[PDB]
């Protein structure tokens, strides 16, 4: 995270992944968001 923007994105990914892990459905927008930032997803997910 080298900016407020990148920080926002990294935490949003983390929150959405945890949300799904806790058993709640994600929205279509969130689904697309996770794809757009698959890289970030894979990072903290790996």
């Amino acid at each position: 995270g080298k900016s407020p923007e990148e920080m926002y994105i990294q935490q949003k990914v983390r929150v959405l992944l945890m949300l799904r892990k806790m058993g709640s459905n994600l929205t279509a927008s969130e689904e697309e968001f996770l794809r757009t930032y698959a890289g970030v997803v894979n990072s903290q997910l790996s």
Binding site: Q11, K12, V15, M18, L19, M22, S24, N25, E30
Partner: protein, 510 residues
């Protein structure tokens, strides 16, 4: 007659003669006279006679004499005056000593005479305890004559009832294991019944309780739940229930659990009530027991039990609790959740949320609904039973209470948390979300965000998170000023609170 003036006095003198040979003879004679009423009364009315008999019995070395004197005392114990004379002659200490006798006929006479004293003679219990009778009796539980055991066990019951000191001595003497062994070894109904009563008495003692469970008491008592003897079955159920809150870690419980599920169908209200209570405790945080109970048709049996019980809360509370346990945290929780619906249980479950149900029952019912809502196939039917408006009403009233402790042993904080938790799960369905929002609950959920109780914060953030998955609702939540209180929850140590709160914020702005 000549009995008082000549007979008794002569015989009592002979029983003290040095040449014990003339004693064994006198002993025999006295024993015979005790067999006939007239002379039995003459004997019991002679303190010198009774004393000579006691003395002789505990000093003799001639079996025939030991047996005759003990038998004499036995025949005298049938009468009130006889019980008193033996008592005053120091017969209890003597009898107890006779429990160490190698002669079976002597042990039977001694134990039965003591049983009669314990049953009718004032002061008998203390005397037996002081003579160390508890230790002697427990040590005799290894004998095999079932009628003898039935009397001995009953003596222990009489002595242990409401007497902690006695219960602890029985424990220290290995009572629990000896009694459990009897339950697994014999089939004599009277012995099983008397032994189950001793166990019932001990089962309310914090020290004996764990010992009985460790000795295999749960499984042993379970062996008799289908016996034709109703008194036996009921005493086993009572003992089982008392012990149940401390056996959630035993195994080899398949049979016990199977039988208990069957008993739920009984027409005997006490049998069903006890069975529900025991099942509720044994399924409490034990996934293996949860698995087995569902395996043997426990869900259907429990639903039927709730249906039949109606407003009888001694049955519905434990039964609903068992169901709550069974629809959560185990490999078969999902099928259980479905089964409740498949066996037509949803209508009654929701019904229990309304009066005349009392708080404890309401609390368990909300917890059950919360688990049932985890099954998507229960979303529509739960809604169609009117669960949501009632859950909201309960929530609103309870919150208002916490703002103006234990109401029937239930804090309203728990109702607020529970109802919000059920709504949180129900909000997974789009149509339920519409009902929920239409009840104008968003403003309330937002206020719950300020609750000082972490668990309430979690479910409040939780339901808003689900509601926020729909664009319009997310806007409405933001319009309610949720942003500030949510931001304050971002640093919570509780992952749920932190995650749900963050999610609502991301959903409101996206």
């Amino acid at each position: 007659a000549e009995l008082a003036t000549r007979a008794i006095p002569e015989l009592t003198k002979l029983l003290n003669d040095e040449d014990q040979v003339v004693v064994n003879k006198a002993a025999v004679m006295v024993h015979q006279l005790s067999k006939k009423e007239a002379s039995r009364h003459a004997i019991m009315r002679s303190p010198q006679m009774v004393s000579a008999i006691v003395r002789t019995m505990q000093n003799t070395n001639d079996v025939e004499t030991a047996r005759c004197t003990a038998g004499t005392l036995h025949n005298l114990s049938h009468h009130r005056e006889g019980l008193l004379a033996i008592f005053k002659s120091g017969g209890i200490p003597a009898l107890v000593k006779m429990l160490g006798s190698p002669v079976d006929s002597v042990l039977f006479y001694a134990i039965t005479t003591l049983h009669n004293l314990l049953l009718h003679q004032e002061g008998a219990k203390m005397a037996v305890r002081l003579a160390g009778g508890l230790q002697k009796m427990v040590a005799l539980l290894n004998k095999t004559n079932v009628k003898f055991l039935a009397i001995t066990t009953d003596c222990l019951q009489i002595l242990a009832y409401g007497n902690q000191e006695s219960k602890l001595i029985i424990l220290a003497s290995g009572g629990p294991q000896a009694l459990v062994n009897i339950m697994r070894t014999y089939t004599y109904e009277k012995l099983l019944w008397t032994t189950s009563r001793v166990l019932k008495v001990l089962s309310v003692c914090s020290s004996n309780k764990p010992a009985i469970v460790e000795a295999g008491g749960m499984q042993a008592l379970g062996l008799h739940l289908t016996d034709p003897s109703q008194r036996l079955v009921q005493n086993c159920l009572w003992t089982l229930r008392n012990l149940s809150d401390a056996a959630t870690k035993q195994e080899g419980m398949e049979g016990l659990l199977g039988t208990l599920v069957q008993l739920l169908g009984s027409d005997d209200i006490n049998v069903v009530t006890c069975a529900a209570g025991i099942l509720s405790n044994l399924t409490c945080n034990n996934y293996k027991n949860k698995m087995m109970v569902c395996q043997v048709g426990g869900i259907e049996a429990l639903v039927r039990t709730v249906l039949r019980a109606g407003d009888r809360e001694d049955i519905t509370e434990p039964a609903i609790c068992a169901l709550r346990h069974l629809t959560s945290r185990h490999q078969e929780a999902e099928m259980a959740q479905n089964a409740v619906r498949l066996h037509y249980g949803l209508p009654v479950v929701v019904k229990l949320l309304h009066p005349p149900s009392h708080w404890p029952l309401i609390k368990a019912t909300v917890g059950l609904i919360r688990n049932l809502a985890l099954c998507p196939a229960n979303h529509a039917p739960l809604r169609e039973q009117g669960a949501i408006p009632r859950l909201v009403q309960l929530l609103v009233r309870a919150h208002q209470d916490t703002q103006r402790q234990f109401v029937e042993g239930v804090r309203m904080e728990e109702i607020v948390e529970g109802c919000t938790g059920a709504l949180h799960i129900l909000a997974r369905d789009v149509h339920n979300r519409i009902v929920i929002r239409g009840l104008n609950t968003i403003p309330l959920f937002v206020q719950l965000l300020y609750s000082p109780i972490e668990n309430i914060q979690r479910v409040a953030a939780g339901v808003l998170c689900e509601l926020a998955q729909d664009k319009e609702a997310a806007e409405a939540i933001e319009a309610e000023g949720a942003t500030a209180p949510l931001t304050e929850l971002l640093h919570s140590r509780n992952e749920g609170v932190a995650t749900y709160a963050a999610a609502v914020l991301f959903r409101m702005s996206e």
